[PDB]
Symmetry: C3
Subunit: 234 residues, 3 copies
C-alpha cells in the first residue's frame, strides 16, 4: 500500500525522525504519499500549536513523494471537541483524532463511546486512530455505524480489539485507514500485522483508503478539501 | 546569491529542518555560506539559551559549505535590549534582531521606531529582520538613516512596506541583507520576491551583502568579528 | 576504535543532530556500534522521560551499524539515585550517569565523592561520564577502586584530571570507556585527545571497552543484559 497516514516527528521527544527522514524513507520503500500527524498540543510531550499552523509552508512534493499536513488531535471530552484550533484547521489537510491518557483518561465504556461518537459526528475529523485500544473500552458496532454515517474512517493501526473493529467496519459499510503510527521513519508504511487482521475478516479491498493516493485524496475531497493540484500525477 | 543569512531549525517546533538538512540543501543549490538564526529564548516556541551557547562546537565547513552561528534575537524594549546574553554573544558570529509579538507587542509608531533605533544604536546587532512588517509601523527613513550611521543592514525578507525600506536604504547609504527566513531547508536561498522589490527601486548591487561570502564576512570583520580562517577560500 | 558510547540528539536544544545523522556519520567513519545517551529528564534542556521509554522501537541495525539505546542519567544525591525510572530502565541497554549542575551542584569533595561512589555501588550504572571534571572535586583513587569493585567503567571524555583518572583506573584494575560526548554527529568517534591521556599513562589496551563491539557487548552481558541477537555479527 503506497500511502501511510499516521506518523510522528521530533516535535515530540518520544519520536526521533524529521520530515526529511520520512521523505527519504518513502522514496526507499516506494511510498508515493504520506502524512505527518504529530500529537495535538494539549498532550504531554507534544509541540506548540504553531507547529501545526506553520505546516502551510511545507512543499507539496519532494523526490516524487507527496506530503500531507496533518495532526493526530486529542479527543478532549464527551462533546467530541479536539485540541485543534480554527487557525490550525486552515493549515492542515488531514485530521486524525483519538484518545490519549494525559488529555482524556479512560472512563466507563459509555463515556468513551459517547466521546468518540461525538468526535465522529462533529464533522471535524477524517480518521479515529487506534479505536481498538483495550485501554479505552467502547461499543464497537455503535462507533463503526456512526463512522459509516459520518464518513469517517476507523484506523487499523500497525504500531498496535482490531479484528472486532475491522469486521464491524466491514458490516457498517465505512472506510478503514491504515497507519503505521511510526515514531521513527524506519517502520514507515509497515502494515504486515494490520493486513493479517483484515484478511482474518475478509475485509473488502475496495474500502481500504491506502490502496492508492488518488483514492485517499478523493476521500478528502468528498469531505470538503479543495483539490491539491501538485498531487494530480500521484 | 550564494549566501543566505536567516533560517530556523527544529529548535522551534514551528520549524522542521536540522543543521544537516540545511547543509545538504546548500550543497544542492550552490550556496557556499549560510547562517542558522534560531529565534531568541524569550520568544515562545524558541530553544533554551544553551542552544546558542553550545553552537561554539559546530564545524565551520561541511562539504565545501561554510556555516555561521547566529541568532534571530528579540527586541525587548524601547532601550534596544535583546534576549542575547554575554555568554551567548561569545559563541555567535551573526546577530540578527527584530520585533516578535510575544516578546514585544506592536505599539504606537513612535514606540516601535524608538525601540528599533535603540537596538540599531546599541552596537550589538548586524541586521534588523523584516523591518517592513506592517504589524509594526515605523518611521522608515529614520530607521534606515540610523542603520546607515551605525552600519547595520536592514533585511529584505523573502518569507515575507519592503519597497519603502529598500528605497530608504538606497538613499541613506546603508547595507541590505537578504534572508529567506526559511522554516524548512526547501526554501533556503530563495530570494525571487526580494529581488523584485530591489529591482523596482533600482537598488545598487554593491550594497547587497549576499553577493558573495567574502563581502558578507568583510562586513562582519568591519563590525569587530575576528577573522574566520576556515572561511578564507570561500 | 569502532565504538562510541556517549552522544546527544536534538531531544536537547543544545545538541543538533538526529538519530539518522549519527547513523550516517558512523557509516562514513567506520563505526560499527554506538549509543545515543541523551541527558536525563531532571536536567534542564533535556527531553521528557517518554523519550527514553519509547527507544524500545528503534531498529537494532541500519546500514550495518548497530544501535544501543542509552541515557546519560543525572546523579541526584548522596544516595546515588539517578533520574531513570524502572520503566525507563526496561527500554534501555546502556546506563551512563554523571554530575550535571542544575541537578546536582558541586559540593564539598567528600559529598561529590560519596554521591559518585553510591551511584557506582547501586548496581544501576555501567559508566560514570567525565569524572575528571574539575568542577566536581573527588577522591579519584577511592572512586576508581569502587568502580573496579562494582565493575563500572570510568569515562575518558573527548569533548572534555583525566590523567589522574586514567592512571587510577589502571592500578585499581577497572574498565575505561571512551566517549566523544558529541553534541553534533560531526565529532562522533573522535578520541584523539582521549588517546593521548591514555598513552601518557601507558594504559592497557585490554581494558578499553571501545576496542571492539563484542568486548563492549560482553561487558553489558556481564552486567546482566540479555544478549542482543541482531548484534552477533558485529
Ligand atoms: Zn506518540
Ligand atoms: Zn495515538
Ligand atoms: Zn500516533
Ligand atoms: Zn519563526
Ligand atoms: Zn522574525
Ligand atoms: Zn526568522
Ligand atoms: Zn549536553
Ligand atoms: Zn555529561
Ligand atoms: Zn553527555
Amino acid at each position: 500500500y503506497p500511502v501511510d497516514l499516521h506518523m510522528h516527528t521530533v516535535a515530540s521527544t518520544h519520536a526521533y525522525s524529521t520530515l526529511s527522514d520520512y521523505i527519504a524513507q518513502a522514496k526507499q520503500k516506494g511510498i508515493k504519499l504520506f502524512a505527518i500527524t504529530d500529537h495535538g498540543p494539549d498532550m504531554e510531550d507534544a509541540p506548540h500549536h504553531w507547529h501545526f499552523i506553520n505546516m502551510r509552508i511545507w512543499p507539496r512534493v519532494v523526490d516524487g513523494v507527496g506530503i500531507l499536513r496533518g495532526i493526530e488531535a486529542n479527543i478532549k471530552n464527551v462533546d467530541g471537541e479536539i485540541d485543534c484550533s480554527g487557525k490550525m484547521f486552515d493549515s492542515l489537510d488531514l485530521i486524525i483524532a483519538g484518545f490519549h491518557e494525559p488529555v482524556f483518561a479512560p472512563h466507563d465504556k459509555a463515556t468513551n463511546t459517547q466521546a468518540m461518537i461525538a468526535t465522529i459526528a462533529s464533522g471535524n475529523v477524517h480518521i479515529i486512530s487506534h479505536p481498538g485500544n483495550p485501554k479505552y473500552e467502547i461499543d464497537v458496532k455503535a462507533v463503526a455505524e456512526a463512522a459509516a454515517k459520518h464518513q469517517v474512517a476507523l484506523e487499523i493501526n500497525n504500531s498496535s480489539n482490531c479484528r472486532e473493529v475491522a469486521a464491524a467496519v466491514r458490516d457498517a459499510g465505512g472506510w478503514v485507514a491504515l497507519g503505521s503510527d511510526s515514531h521513527t521513519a524506519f517502520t514507515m508504511g509497515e502494515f504486515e500485522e494490520c493486513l493479517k487482521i483484515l484478511d482474518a475478516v475478509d475485509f473488502p479491498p475496495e474500502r481500504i483508503l491506502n490502496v492508492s493516493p488518488r483514492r485517499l485524496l478523493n476521500f478528502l475531497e468528498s469531505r470538503g478539501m479543495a483539490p491539491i493540484a501538485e498531487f494530480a500525477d500521484l
